[PDB]
Design a protein around this ligand. Sequence first.
Ligand code: NX7
Ligand code: NX7
Length: 284
Amino acid sequence: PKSMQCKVILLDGSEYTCDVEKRSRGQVLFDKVCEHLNLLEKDYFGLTYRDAENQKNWLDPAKEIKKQVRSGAWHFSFNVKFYPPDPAQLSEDITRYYLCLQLRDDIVSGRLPCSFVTLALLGSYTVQSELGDYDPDECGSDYISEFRFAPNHTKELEDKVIELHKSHRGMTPAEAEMHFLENAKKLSMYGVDLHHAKDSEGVEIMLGVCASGLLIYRDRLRINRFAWPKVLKISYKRNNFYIKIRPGEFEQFESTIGFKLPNHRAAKRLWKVCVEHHTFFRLL
Ligand SMILES: O=C(c1c(F)cccc1F)N1CCCC1
Ligand SMILES: O=C(c1c(F)cccc1F)N1CCCC1
């Protein structure tokens, strides 16, 4: 039996290495990673890899790893795939913990925009969870934390983190993580996977895929929202991605909205993530 070495970037930034038989399906590797992480609530998570364009793709657990990664290194990242709309309802604290680590990267990367105050409050719960109670000995007026809190750090943000940290005395890691999640879950881009596309008139838009449905971000004025119940059908033809919407209260027939993606692969990627998210909605 010939086995390929796999390297997986974990959400703390560390690297897990293991081997799987070269014709292994993605589920085999994913099961090894989740056992390493002591993670039972595995359905919210998945593995990604980067193609020769360094675009992120979901490893399909049902298909051979080799057929997916094709010519690339067997190098993967462990990630949240389906962001729970109510993290309080997860059965395990360790699940909430990995969700926190993913959200911390969502914030630092700018995928999850956040007000100054929310950056500081989230940062304060992270510090409380990671270091425990506020200690003045480690923090002077000049203090800068090792923790990355934001896409751009300022001394003002570091000060606000410390001020809110002082208020969390006695909070345990699981409690601080639950508070982190209660705040993060409310942010407008929480759990939203964004895809570049053009509308039928060729105007640049963004399509967001999340638990609740599909978002079309046309401009700061006019964000189209299609709850899953409203989406009849989704399709991809060549580079074209089409959404069919149930008849409105004044339509007799469904409406078809068409989008142009960069290439055929980007259309197929968007279709698959939409199908997978809709099934998630169906089981909520
Ligand atoms: O076209 C759809 C679909 C969707 F993805 C969202 C809502 C309604 C639908 F018919 N599917 C194709 C594969 C299974 C789901
Ligand atoms: O069974 C699924 C699921 C999956 F296993 C693959 C793709 C889409 C899904 F909804 N889930 C249960 C809880 C979270 C997702």
